[PDB]
Design a protein around this ligand. Structure first.
Ligand SMILES: CC(=O)N[C@@H]1[C@@H](O)[C@H](O[C@@H]2O[C@H](CO)[C@@H](O[C@@H]3O[C@H](CO)[C@@H](O)[C@H](O)[C@H]3NC(C)=O)[C@H](O)[C@H]2NC(C)=O)[C@@H](CO)O[C@@H]1O
Ligand code: CA
Ligand code: CA
Ligand code: CL
Ligand code: CL
Ligand code: CL
Ligand code: MG
Ligand code: MG
Ligand code: MG
Length: 537
């Protein structure tokens, strides 16, 4: 009687009812896009082509110091009230007044928002930035007529959401399953053929594997080991498409509170020897079953941005980011990391023993295995390390608070190098209660920040390329992180119950179901239920 699409955007041990789009640490990951539709979805796989949703147009000013957005008329909230400029203006003012709700750093860019009329908003910028409509689209727009009356938006759980997107009705909710049904007032209802999102609680990759192999899922983006043998071979309806994704690296804490570990981690010779100890292709072969590409760029750029790469820089530092056990041992010796207590593990120049604790998230088994391989490879050059696999929130918090030693992490990936470099190295993103982990190495370089903040400042493509080369040089020469590989956008789909999926023959955009992939809105608008085959009673 209704089509239910079973999706898996995020692992949870238990579902807590939270649909606050600003509360990324604690909300459910079907809130953004599916409850709160964006102004615009930029199709990152297709050159950031803008797909207009609740806005029908935007227009930048002469000098890139402002931009105006035109709001689509006739759009209703799920309670029947009108979607207008009022809501956009309020949402941005809310994030400005309460910066712990800024999860992107939008406050650094937008100094003010002004209602031009009921269907146009103007944004004033702190600085010139041709990329700011992209930034603006990241901010959730919530209904002012509801949220302005809310006690405290920063602690509002929003259990009965009023939304603009396709699925706003909470049909069923249990700690282990919830079902999110069609917005009865959805502006783009004629384009939508899925009735409900069905979201089961899955805690880790182990629990996932059993369910996906058994055909219990429709749309997922989890790591699956030996995928051809385990999942694809199980049914002719089991499909996948793994387009290339972003950089993954070992990130070291430059502000480690332990004296010995700080001494090691802040030493560029040590970071380079660490990096040379790793066998990146073996990590890809074993931990990812071949699903990745070696990243031997000291700057972490990766091979998917060859038009952008300064090949002289890449070549200069590539040796430090290539498997070379003997080279690593020789460098540790030259630097003065000498074993002075006969245990085969190097000690710091001041003579102190230490063991690096390397963390990755609990249940992210491909990363867990990567870390364990690295532990073994590090031991072969005399670097003592051991693995920890803390709960994601604990993992995350340790990075935010700077209490970790080394962490393995992936990064956002975009149509140009700025998505990675800015999110991973801009020191402004090292502070703020809404900030993610990505820049939390606490390396700070003012010249680097300056180049990043200038990337979209001139409409001059050659200058922008020179800025990129400058960024690449700084990060490479300082071996700020230890890049390992370029990963994949894991994505599995089931044709048993639905058709219309994006895939290698229909590569319309990033196909993943994770929150933070706004294209998943466009994707679900393409899916159509299948007439089930008849069976007993
Ligand atoms: C609050 C919010 O919207 N946060 C978004 C954040 O969750 C997104 O980060 C992605 O989250 C998914 C889910 O945890 C990550 O997918 C996992 O990758 C592991 C490593 O390969 C696999 O072992 C897991 O199987 C897989 N889990 C699932 C359920 O698919 C994904 O790696 C992660 N990406 C990054 C980068 O952190 C981001 C990006 O979409 O957006 C929001 O920040
Ligand atoms: Ca209103
Ligand atoms: Ca020793
Ligand atoms: Cl509801
Ligand atoms: Cl496919
Ligand atoms: Cl490089
Ligand atoms: Mg269950
Ligand atoms: Mg419809
Ligand atoms: Mg459609």
């Amino acid at each position: 009687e209704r089509s239910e699409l079973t999706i898996h955007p995020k692992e949870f041990t238990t579902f807590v009812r939270n649909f606050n789009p600003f509360l990324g640490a604690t909300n459910l990951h079907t809130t953004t896009d599916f409850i709160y539709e964006p102004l615009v979805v930029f199709n990152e796989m297709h050159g950031n082509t803008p797909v207009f949703r609740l806005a029908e147009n935007f227009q930048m000013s002469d000098d890139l110091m402002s931009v105006t957005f035109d709001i689509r008329k006739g759009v209703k909230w799920s309670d029947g009230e009108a979607f207008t400029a009022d809501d956009v203006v309020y949402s941005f003012n809310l994030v400005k007044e309460k910066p712990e709700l800024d999860q992107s750093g939008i406050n650094s860019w937008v100094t003010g928002v002004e209602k031009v009329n009921d269907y146009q908003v103007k944004f004033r910028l702190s600085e010139a930035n041709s990329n700011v409509p992209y930034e603006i689209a990241k901010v959730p727009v919530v209904p002012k007529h509801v949220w302005s009356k809310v006690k405290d938006p920063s602690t509002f759980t929003n259990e009965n959401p009023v939304g603009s997107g396709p699925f706003t009705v909470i049909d069923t909710f249990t700690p282990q399953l919830y079902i999110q049904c069609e917005n009865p007032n959805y502006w783009d209802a004629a384009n939508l053929d899925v009735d409900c999102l069905r979201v089961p609680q899955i805690a880790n990759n182990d629990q996932f594997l059993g369910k996906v192999v058994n055909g219990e899922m429709d749309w997922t983006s989890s790591f699956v080991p030996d995928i051809d043998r385990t999942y694809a071979a199980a049914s002719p309806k089991h499909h996948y498409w793994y387009p290339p994704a972003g950089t993954q690296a070992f990130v070291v804490n430059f502000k480690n509170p332990d004296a010995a570990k700080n001494e090691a981690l802040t030493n560029v010779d040590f970071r380079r020897a660490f990096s040379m100890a790793l066998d990146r292709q073996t990590i890809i072969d074993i931990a990812f079953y071949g699903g990745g590409t070696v990243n031997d760029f000291a700057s972490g750029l990766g091979y998917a941005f060859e038009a952008w790469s300064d090949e002289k820089t890449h070549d200069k530092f590539k040796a430090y980011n290539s498997y070379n056990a003997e080279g690593a041992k020789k460098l540790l010796a030259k630097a003065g990391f000498k074993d002075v207590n006969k245990d085969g593990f190097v000690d710091t120049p001041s003579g102190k023993s230490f063991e690096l604790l390397i963390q990755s998230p609990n249940g992210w088994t491909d990363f867990n295995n990567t870390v364990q391989l690295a532990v073994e490879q590090l031991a072969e050059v005399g670097i003592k390390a051991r693995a920890r696999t803390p709960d994601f929130s604990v993992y995350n918090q340790a990075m935010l608070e700077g209490t970790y030693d080394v962490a393995y992490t992936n990064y956002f990936h975009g149509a140009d190098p700025y998505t990675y470099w800015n999110s991973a190295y801009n020191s402004a993103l090292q502070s703020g209660d809404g900030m993610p982990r990505f820049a939390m190495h606490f390396y700070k370089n003012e010249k680097l920040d300056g180049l990043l903040n200038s990337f979209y400042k001139t409409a001059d493509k050659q200058e922008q390329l020179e800025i990129a080369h400058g960024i690449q040089q700084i990060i490479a020469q300082d071996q700020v992180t230890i890049p390992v590989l370029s990963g994949a956008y894991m994505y599995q789909y089931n044709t048993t119950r639905f058709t219309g999926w994006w895939n290698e023959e229909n590569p319309k955009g990033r196909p993943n179901i994770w929150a933070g992939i706004p294209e998943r809105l466009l994707h679900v608008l393409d899916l159509k239920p299948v007439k089930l085959e008849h069976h007993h009673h």
